[PDB]
Amino acid sequence: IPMSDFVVNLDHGDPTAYEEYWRKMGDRCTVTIRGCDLMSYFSDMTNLCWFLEPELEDAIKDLHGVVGNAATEDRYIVVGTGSTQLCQAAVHALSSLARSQPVSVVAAAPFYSTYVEETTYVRSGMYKWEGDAWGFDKKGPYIELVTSPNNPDGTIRETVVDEAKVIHDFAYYWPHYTPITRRQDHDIMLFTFSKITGHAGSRIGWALVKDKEVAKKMVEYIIVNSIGVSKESQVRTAKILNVLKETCKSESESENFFKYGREMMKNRWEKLREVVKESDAFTLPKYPEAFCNYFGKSLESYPAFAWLGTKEETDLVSELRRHKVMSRAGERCGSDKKHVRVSMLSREDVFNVFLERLANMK
């Protein structure tokens, strides 16, 4: 079997890039759970989010503290089974408190394809996905989704359209990906564990929510949806997240996660960048340089996804399938046939194989 017939799967952003890193960290990352632990449905009935584990709460807030990307004071924390359940909890919670329904849900194009799935699959009478925000005019209550750094195109975003409301999805707003220009302080701020460290099968995200009443409804949603979130997932995320925090007080460019992650993304993007340059069809986006409060230097953005473009009237997702490279169709993301989103967080060898095949075609 040649590495011409091997399918390189860069459609999903399964973040496996980070595995060797975590392997190396050895015995301190380990989580030990005994037969009788984590048995109860409840964590703490004193918290608005009663199914959130204290060690995890502390870890989340400590971590936004050391990095300085989001405000965690005077606001409620809600955990979900990935940020996926969290964005839907928020949409359901904000829809519940709107004067009237359906509430229009929009996001600037190109947007995170999954959003169209999340807002469409249960055929709920509470909210209606209304496509691109730029092209959104419609009256009545709406919710805007703002992914920054964006998915697919990695751009830094702000809103674009008075009681209607907004959700900020800052899943990729970490120092290894983009500079920390500012400590965010918005009404609803969504984060995901999978994207910081690569632990995607842990299924953990969190929401920082200012409005007390929105936090309450997100919670109710989750309780009816899954009665909360895996305790052991939460205890594990805590340990890894704590280790990541101890890692920040290190000079080692192989211990310090954010200086490990960032170098890797730089190395990966500089490589992809050669390939694209010495090629006649392709186009990557241009990323402004910006000062980083965390790193204390002025540096470039290296997004988890490459928005791969074509200048010629090709149907770019299909061409890549033909060379055994799965990508995410641009049409899926409110773009056009000339664009693909390719994951930049795969393993070394897969990424290389991907570059190799990107060179070896017309």
Ligand X SMILES: Cc1ncc(COP(=O)(O)O)c(CN)c1O
99 binds its own copies (CB under 8 A): no
Q: Is 170 annotated as a binding residue?
A: yes
Task: Count CA within 13 A, CB hemisphere, residue 325.
Answer: 26
The span from the CA of 90 to the CA of 173, in Å, is: 19
* Cα–Cα distance measured from residue 82 to residue 125, given in angstroms and rounded to the nearest whole number: 24
Taking the least distance from each CB to ligand X, the nearer of 205 and 261 is 205
Query: With b meaning 16 or more CB within 10 Å and e meaning fewer, what string describes 337-346?
Result: ebbbbbbbbb
283 labeled binding residue = no
- For residue 198, give the nearest of 53, 85, 346, 317 by alpha carbon: 346
Q: Is 11 annotated as ligand-binding?
A: no
Residues 133-162 that bind ligand X (CB under 6 A): 147, 151
The piece of 187-195, 215-223, 274-282, 353-361 that touches ligand X (CB under 6 A) is 187-195
Cis previous bond, 2, omega within 30: no
Phi and psi at 342, nearest 5°, equal -120, 140
Q: Which of 195, 199, 217, 339 binds ligand X (CB under 6 A)?
A: 195
**Interaction between residue 169 and ligand X (CB under 6 A):** yes
- Does residue 15 have a cis bond before it (omega within 30 degrees)? no
Confirm whether residue 194 is marked as ligand binding: yes
Single out the residue of 16, 84, 184, 256 in contact with ligand X (rule: CB under 6 A).
84
Residue 65 or 102: the one with the smaller Cβ distance to its own copies is 102
CA trace torsion 304, 190, 86, 242 (10° rounding): 80
How far apart (Å, rounded) are the C-alpha atoms in residues 158 and 52? 30
Residue numbers 59-98 binding its own copies by CB under 8 A: 81-82, 84-85, 88, 92
151 contacts which partner out of its own copies, ligand X, none, CB within 5 to 8 A by kind? ligand X
Residue number of the CB atom closest to ligand X: 82
User: Of these, 110, 141, 179, 205, which contacts ligand X (CB under 6 A)?
Assistant: 205
224, 280, 296, 313: residue in contact with its own copies (rule CB under 8 A): 224
Q: Does 36 bind its own copies (CB under 8 A)?
A: yes
DSSP three-state, residue 135? coil
Residue 46 binds its own copies, judged by CB under 8 A:
no
To 10 degrees, the CA torsion angle through 160, 174, 299, 145?
-10
Using CB under 8 A, pick the residue from 1, 2, 26, 286 that binds its own copies: 26
327 is an interface residue for its own copies by CB under 8 A? no
Is 334 among the residues that bind ligand X (CB under 6 A)?
no
Regarding 176 and contact with its own copies (CB under 8 A), the answer is: no
Q: Which residues contact 202 (CB under 8 A, 6 or more apart)?
A: 193, 194, 233, 236, 237
* Residue reference for tokens 């009443």: 213
CB-based contact 8:350 (threshold 8 Å): yes
What is the rounded CA–CA span in Å between residue 258 and residue 295? 9
**Interacting residues toward ligand X by CB under 6 A:** 13, 82-84, 112, 147, 151, 169, 171, 192, 194-195, 200, 205, 227
Residues near its own copies, by CB under 8 A = 12, 14-16, 18-20, 22-23, 25-36, 38-43, 51, 81-82, 84-85, 88, 92, 101, 114, 117-118, 121-126, 194, 198-204, 221, 224-233, 236, 240, 243
* Feature table: binding site: 41, 83-84, 151, 169-172, 192-195, 203
